[PDB]
From a paper:
Ferritin from the marine pennate diatom Pseudo-nitzschia multiseries (PmFTN) plays a key role in sustaining growth in iron-limited ocean environments. Typically formed from 24 subunits arranged as a symmetric, hollow sphere, ferritins take up soluble Fe2+ and catalyze its oxidation, with the resulting Fe3+ being stored as an oxy-hydroxide mineral in its central cavity. The di-iron catalytic ferroxidase center of PmFTN (sites A and B) has a nearby third iron site (site C) in an arrangement typically observed in prokaryotic ferritins. Here we demonstrate that Glu-44, a site C ligand, and Glu-130, a residue that bridges iron bound at sites B and C, limit the rate of post-oxidation reorganization of iron coordination and the rate at which Fe3+ exits the ferroxidase center for storage within the mineral core.
To explore the role of site C in iron mineralization by PmFTN, Glu-44 was substituted with glutamine and histidine, residues that occur naturally at this position in other characterized ferritins. Three crystal structures were obtained from E44Q PmFTN crystals soaked for 5 min (E44Q Fe (5 min)), 45 min (E44Q Fe (45 min)), and overnight (E44Q Fe (o.n.)) in an aerobic Fe2+ solution. Iron was not found within the B-channels in structures from crystals with shorter soak durations. Substitution of Glu-44 with glutamine resulted in the loss of iron binding at site C in iron soaking experiments. In the E44Q variant, this rearrangement occurs ∼75-fold more rapidly than in the wild type protein (and ∼30-fold more rapidly than in the E130A variant). The overall mineralization kinetics for E44Q PmFTN showed that this enhancement does not translate into a large increase in the rate of overall core formation.
Author numbering:
A (entry chain A), C (entry chain E), E (entry chain D): 2 to 158
B (entry chain F): 2 to 159
D (entry chain H): 1 to 159
The structure:
C-alpha cells in the first residue's frame, strides 16, 4: 500500500530534516553565528517532535513503522556563507511540504479520513514555516550586500 | 438523501453505543469488577455526549433529526468473563468508526465541507478509542492467564 | 588524528543509541506495553541530548564534527518479548560505555585534560545507566516467569 | 447646510479609503518580507476605520444622513518598488486626509455649526501628529536606504 | 620542585591576565568603546578571582606561594583599533590555557590527583573562554569592514 509506505517515509523525512537543521547549527556555531545556530537547533528539535508525532499516530492506527537510516546531511560540505545555509533550509522545507502533500494525496485516494485529519495541522504549519524561512532568507540576502551588516542580524534578533 | 440518513443513523449509533457501555457496566458491577464498571459508565456518558454534539450540529445545519429507538442490548446475555465484555466493546468501537467513515464518505460525495470538518475530531478520537480499548483487551487477555491476577487490574488501575 | 575521529564517532553512537531506544518504544507501544514504551521514549530523548552536548563541546574546542548517517535499528526484527528488548538495551548501554572509554583512552594518550574532564560526568552516568537497565532486566526476567505478571507491572509504572 | 451634510458623509468615505490604502501598504510590505512595517500599516488601517466609525456615530446622533459609498480600490501598490515609495504615498494620504478635514471644518464654520467644529478639534490635532510621525519615518527610511541592507535593520529592530 | 614552581607561576599568570584585561578596558574607555570596556573590566575581576582560588587551594595543600610582581601590560602601546585589542586578548587566553595545561602535565607526572581534580573546571572554563573571545573577535573583524558599523556592536550589545 502506497499509503503505508509513504507514511513511513514521512517519519524518515522528519528525522532527515531534524538532522539537516542540526548540520546548519553546527556550520553556524563553527562560524561564530551563535544566533542563527540557536534558531537551527530549536528547529532541529521541533522536526524531531514532528517525526515522533507521526510515529505515535502510526502506532495508534496500526500503521507499521520501520525506522530507516537517517542519512548524513550533505549540504554542509559546500556552504560558504549564511545565505547558502538558509537557501538549503528553504529547499528542505519545500521538500517537507511536498512529501506531506503526497502523503495527503495517497490518503485522499484511499478515503483515509483519519489520516487526512491528522495531517491538517502539519499542512498549515508548513505554510508558516516556508513563509518564515523565506522571509529570513530575504533579510539575509539584503543585509549581506554590506560587509559586516549581517553580523548585526545575528547578534540583535 | 443519503447524507441526511447517515447523519441520523450516526446519532443512533452514539446512543446505542452509550447503552451498550451501560450494559457492560452492569455486568461488571454484578460480578464485582467495580473499577471496570466505572470505566464503562464513564464511556457511556461520553458516547451520549457525542450523540448530543451531533444533534446540536444537525439542529444548527437544518439536518432533520428523527430520534430512533435505542435497542435492548443483547451481548450481555452471553458474557462470562471480562475478556468477553472487552471484546464486545472493541467490536462496538470498530462499528462506531465504520459508521463515521460511512458518513464522511457520503459528505465527501456531496462536497459537504462543513460536515467533513465537523467529523475530523471524531475521526481522530476513534483512532484513540480503538487503540485504548485494544490495549486494555491485550492486558486483560494476558493477565487472565493466571487465576486471580486480573482482579489486580481492577483494584490497582480503574 | 585519532582523538578527533573518536570524538566524531561518539556523536554517532549517541544518536544511534537514541534511534535504538526509539525502536524499543515502538515495539513496546505496538505490543501495548505503554509504560515501558514511555521509558524508552524518554531515554531516546536523553541520549540525543547527550549527543548534542558532545557536538556543543566539539564546536567550542574546534573539533570538526561531520554528522554521519544514523543507522537503521535492526534488533526490533528479532524481539518477541519484553525481555528481548531490555536485553538489547543493556547491550546498547554496554556499547555506549565502551565508546566513551575508547574516547577517554585516546584523550589520555594525547594528554588532553579538557576532553578527559568533559568525559567525567558521562563516565559516572554510564555506571548509573548500566545499573538501572540491569536492574529492570532482572525484574522483567523474574516477573515474566508467571503468565500475565509482567503486564500487571508495566501497568504500575 | 446641504454642503456640510454632504462633506460629512464624504469624510466617512475618506477615512475608509485611507484604511484600505494602509491595508494595501501592509500587504506590499508583507509580500516583500518587511513584517515590521507591515504591522505598523495594519495598525494604522484599523485606526483609520475607527475614525470613520466615529464619524458615523456622531452623524447618527446629530441626524446627519449617512449613505455608505464604494470604498475605492487602492492603486498606488501597482507602482511601489521600495519602502520609500510606500511611505511617500502614505504621507500623501495623510496630507489629503488633513485637507479633507479642514474643508469640512470650513463648511461647519460657514454654517455656524459649533458642534461639528468641536467634534473635529481632536481630529485636527491628531492629523498634526500623524503627518509628523509619517514624515519622520519617511526621513529615516530615505536616509537608511542609502546603504544596501541597512533599512532591513530598521524593520527588524524597530517596528 | 617543578609542580610547586608551576603552581606559583599559575597564580602569577592569573594576575598578569587580570592586568592585561584592565589595560584593555582602559584603551576601550579612552577611545569611547564603553561597552567593550565594561566587558574587559568584568573579565579582569574574574581572572583575579581565579588567581585567588589558586592561592586558596595552595594554602590548603601547603603549596608555598610567594607573590611575584604583576608585570606591566605591554600590548596597549601598539593597539590602534578594537580588532587589535581582541586579538591580544585571544592570545592571552591561549597562553592562560597553555599555562594550565603545563601545570596539569606536572601534576600528572607526580600522580597528584588532588591538583588534577582541582584543575578540571579551569580546563573546561578555558575551552569556553577561548571560544567566546574567538567568536567576539570574528564579529569585530567582520563588522569593522564597514566604517562605523562596529560602533553599533558596542552601543547595542
Ligand atoms: Fe517538520
Ligand atoms: Fe463515540
Ligand atoms: Fe548516552
Ligand atoms: Fe484619519
Ligand atoms: Fe583565568
Amino acid at each position: 500500500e502506497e499509503l503505508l509506505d509513504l507514511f513511513n517515509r514521512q517519519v524518515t523525512q522528519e528525522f532527515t530534516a531534524s538532522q539537516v537543521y542540526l548540520s546548519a547549527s553546527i556550520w553556524f556555531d563553527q562560524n561564530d553565528w551563535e544566533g542563527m545556530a540557536a534558531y537551527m537547533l530549536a528547529q532541529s528539535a521541533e522536526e524531531r517532535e514532528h517525526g515522533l508525532g507521526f510515529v505515535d499516530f502510526a502506532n495508534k492506527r496500526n500503521i507499521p513503522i520501520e525506522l530507516q537510516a537517517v542519512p548524513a546531511p550533505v549540504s554542509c560540505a559546500e556552504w560558504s556563507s549564511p545565505e547558502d545555509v538558509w537557501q538549503s533550509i528553504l529547499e528542505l522545507e519545500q521538500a517537507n511540504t511536498r512529501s506531506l502533500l503526497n502523503l495527503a494525496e495517497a490518503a485522499s485516494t484511499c478515503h483515509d479520513f483519519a489520516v487526512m485529519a491528522f495531517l491538517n495541522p502539519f499542512h498549515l504549519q508548513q505554510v508558516n514555516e516556508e513563509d518564515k524561512i523565506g522571509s529570513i532568507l530575504a533579510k539575509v540576502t539584503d543585509e549581506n550586500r554590506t560587509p559586516g551588516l549581517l553580523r548585526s542580524l545575528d547578534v540583535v534578533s
